[PDB]
Design a protein around this ligand. Structure first.
Ligand SMILES: *C(=O)N1C[C@H](NOS(=O)(=O)O)CC[C@H]1C(N)=O
Length: 263
């Protein structure tokens, strides 16, 4: 019941001063490694994968949805808007908003995705439609990042997020073109090199989405293509007891290294 990898993650967690959640799926054999795999964690920016995937699903039944313009007004800007601020009083397409949300983690872009789905509950509804009974999105940006201990809003579990990420990127939750677009976007992420990627050999290819929030919450969810192996799906969630705790991306890298060394 407690594997060697689980014992190592427990030792990492003990030295980290926070709470660590890990779910690995190895698609070479569909085996799973779970650490606090059924405990809820605040998703923060990693929830953007579900919102972008839901808009990709919408695009399966709409000619050129991704080219549809969305107006960006000054009042739409929130706390972190590296792409959207360039387009205030103009428009961005849903493809541009999806890329900005995933690759630059633009929070104004994420709010446009949420609105395109009918609000946070529309993102949750998409999760349910692809078999994820755990994910819940409750708020918009930026308050979905409050990451308060014990608060179920805007949370999921590592087990559920790993299974969902596998279905979206490697399975058939999306159509073929849409799945390929999602993987292309994730592989072009700009924010991930200090997190899961840092713990892996340079030769392994990664597409990922990071997140962070209050309580020193530090997250990453990744699809990994190891050299000479079938892909892996890896979720590393981390959160700490005090609201102003510092980020700990090194803990995510350490967890990824333990997983890689255990394969
Ligand atoms: C998402 O977690 N956020 C938006 C942006 N994400 O960048 S990260 O993925 O590199 O952390 C800034 C942090 C965070 C937020 N609190 O809005």
């Amino acid at each position: 019941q407690t594997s060697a990898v689980q014992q190592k993650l427990a030792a990492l967690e003990k030295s980290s001063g926070g709470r660590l959640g890990v779910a690995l799926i190895d698609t070479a054999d569909n085996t799973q490694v779970l650490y606090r795999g059924d405990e809820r964690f605040p998703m923060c920016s990693t929830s953007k994968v579900m919102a972008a995937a839901a808009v990709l699903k919408q695009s399966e039944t709409q000619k050129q949805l991704l080219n549809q313009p969305v107006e960006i007004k000054p009042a739409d800007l929130v706390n972190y808007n590296p792409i959207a601020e360039k387009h205030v009083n103009g428009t961005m397409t849903l493809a541009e908003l999806s890329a900005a949300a995933l690759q630059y983690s633009d929070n104004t872009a994420m709010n446009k995705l949420i609105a395109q789905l009918g609000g946070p509950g529309g993102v949750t509804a998409f999760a349910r439609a692809i078999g994820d009974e755990t994910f819940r999105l409750d708020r918009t940006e930026p308050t979905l990042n409050t990451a308060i201990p014990g608060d179920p809003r805007d949370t999921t579990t590592p087990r559920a997020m790993a299974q969902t990420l596998r279905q979206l990127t490697l399975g058939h939750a999306l159509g073929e073109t849409q799945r390929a677009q999602l993987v292309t976007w994730l592989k072009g992420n700009t924010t991930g090199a200090a997190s899961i990627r840092a713990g892996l050999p340079t030769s392994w290819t990664v597409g990922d989405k990071t997140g962070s929030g209050d309580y020193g919450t530090t997250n990453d969810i990744a699809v990994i293509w190891p050299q000479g192996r079938a892909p892996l799906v890896l979720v590393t969630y981390f959160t700490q007891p005090q609201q102003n705790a510092e980020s700990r991306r090194d803990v995510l890298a350490s967890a990824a290294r333990i997983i890689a060394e255990g394969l």
